[PDB]
Design a protein around this ligand. Structure first.
Ligand SMILES: *[C@H](O)[C@H](C[C@@H]1CCNC1=O)NC(=O)[C@H](CC(C)C)NC(=O)O[C@H]1CC[C@H](C(C)C)CC1
Lengths: 298, 296
């Protein structure tokens, strides 16, 4: 039986209307236009030759307002420039007439968000990703994608949580939150940086097993249980995040009647392999669906 | 090494702007608003009581324009039936009607779906039209009228309007000429689904992605021609392989020939024998040649 559990993004129209192109000298990439502000990664200020140890404090001082061209496709007059962590905060003289209600909230590991991939300020595609416990994401990003933004939507309010900066050697990616911090504390310098060891997102694995139960596949449920604190002590030493319950997990426990503690026991038995059986078409544990995904799609 | 090969959907903004809610009596679902026309599935005419064997020609005759309510989160002054779809004329024109066309997608092709409930877009995902003319995706009650589309430039090709769920949890709908994909009937009755098959051209594209990603252990100088593969495929639950410029592009990027990989499919179909290809132990057939060219 097809569960109907798929990678789903938010409709991207609200964010498409905010995408612009920012050019500084030779460098061009994407920016996010909210009210009278345009956000973009600050390495747009860096010339290709000096990208390996940029002095950003000095580059900013050396700029005027005319050093930045901002174009909307999907010109703007830059009337201020400032720097916030790894991002530029440009002020423009026209308020984006299609600004959505929004917030800036950093996301934590295990949370999913949508990404609108853009090239020269033109949206080209959207996909969903999960912030990993080593503060990376997968997805698809090519040359020119920097400034592509990731977001969620709760109600009318968009939460902007990601602005794309870089690719790492193992092919994964990272970027900034809109408070300017880089996720994982990576530096926006063109140098090899090795990511930390990854981990399974325990709360998402729980959601996925609940999804399996809701889809009729529950051979792996036994009466046996492992408490949250006991699972988390075992988690530190076998590459799993701490489990923290939510009202969203709790809805799934109520619907199925299978308790969290039974699925934490199940996880301890399953992470080695399924000894010949499948769960939701898979033979490994899946951890990129969230409790909220499962409540919405099943 | 993460390949960068992911399920990617088209930006949905153009289509979000066309979604409306359609109500008829006590039923509601989604419709697509292009110029002065609102498209929606005809079973919006059916009382829930009578979904098993509706008489669509009698239901249409019993309606008036004032039977239908259109709300855009709109006054109907016309109504006709085309195949399994309604074509409602309303008095206001959609000003944000994108340039568009109407195409019927073939098996193996990918399109984007904008899933909507009560006229409100809620999610977007990419599906592949299976060789049995079903799709996966995520569709709950109220999702009918959700539309699938591709893009060729700024032009939107509307290819799908969601209609129903089959016994096994898969889905199907109409093309915009009013035909159901796979000739399924828009009635709430058990219907026999043909067994699925492997889309060979997509399997080839996935193997090319692997080679570009530096995973080429399966690449031998052995070759199978298209016609031997096709003969083999008929008996082994695969589709006819048809070459394309998109595929040729990948054989030129990698220096590996289509026939080398056709040979490879015949071996890997038996299993990878302890090895992996892009984190998988089974062949993957839902990434197209176009996906791979564009994403790698
Ligand atoms: C329109 O919104 C709706 C969507 C389906 C509802 C649930 N999931 C959907 O995809 N379509 C219908 O309700 C459709 C109308 C008929 C006139 C064709 N009926 C339908 O899809 O019925 C099916 C529901 C599920 C069952 C399974 C055996 C469980 C089979 C019939």
């Amino acid at each position: 039986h097809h569960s109907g559990l798929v990678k789903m993004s938010h409709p991207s129209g609200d964010v498409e209307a905010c995408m612009v192109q920012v050019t500084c000298g030779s460098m061009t990439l994407n920016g996010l236009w909210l009210d009278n502000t345009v956000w973009c990664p600050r390495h747009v200020m860096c010339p290709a030759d000096q990208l390996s140890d940029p002095n950003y404090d000095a580059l900013l001082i050396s700029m005027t307002n005319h050093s930045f061209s901002v174009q909307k496709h999907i010109n703007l007059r830059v009337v201020g420039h400032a720097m916030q962590g790894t991002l530029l905060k440009l002020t423009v003289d026209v308020a984006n007439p299609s600004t959505p209600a929004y917030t800036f909230t950093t996301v934590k590991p295990g949370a999913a968000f949508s990404v609108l991939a853009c090239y020269n300020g033109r949206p080209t595609g959207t996909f969903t990703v999960v912030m990993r416990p080593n503060y990376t994401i997968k997805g698809s990003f090519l040359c020119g994608s920097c400034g592509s933004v990731g977001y969620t939507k709760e109600g009318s309010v968009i939460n902007f949580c990601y602005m794309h900066q870089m690719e790492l050697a193992n092919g994964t990616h990272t970027g900034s939150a809109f408070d300017g911090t880089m996720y994982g504390a990576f530096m926006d310098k063109q140098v090899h940086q090795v990511q930390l060891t990854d981990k399974y997102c325990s709360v998402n694995v729980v959601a996925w097993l609940y999804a399996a139960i809701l889809n009729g596949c529950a051979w792996f449920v036994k009466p046996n249980r492992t408490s949250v604190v006991s699972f988390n002590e075992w988690a530190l030493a076998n590459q799993f995040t701490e489990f923290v319950g939510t009202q969203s997990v709790d809805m799934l426990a109520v619907k199925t009647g299978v308790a969290i503690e039974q699925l934490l026991y199940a996880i301890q038995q399953l992470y080695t392999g399924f000894q010949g059986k499948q769960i939701l078409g898979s033979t490994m544990l899946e951890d990129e669906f969230t409790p909220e995904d499962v409540n919405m799609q099943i």
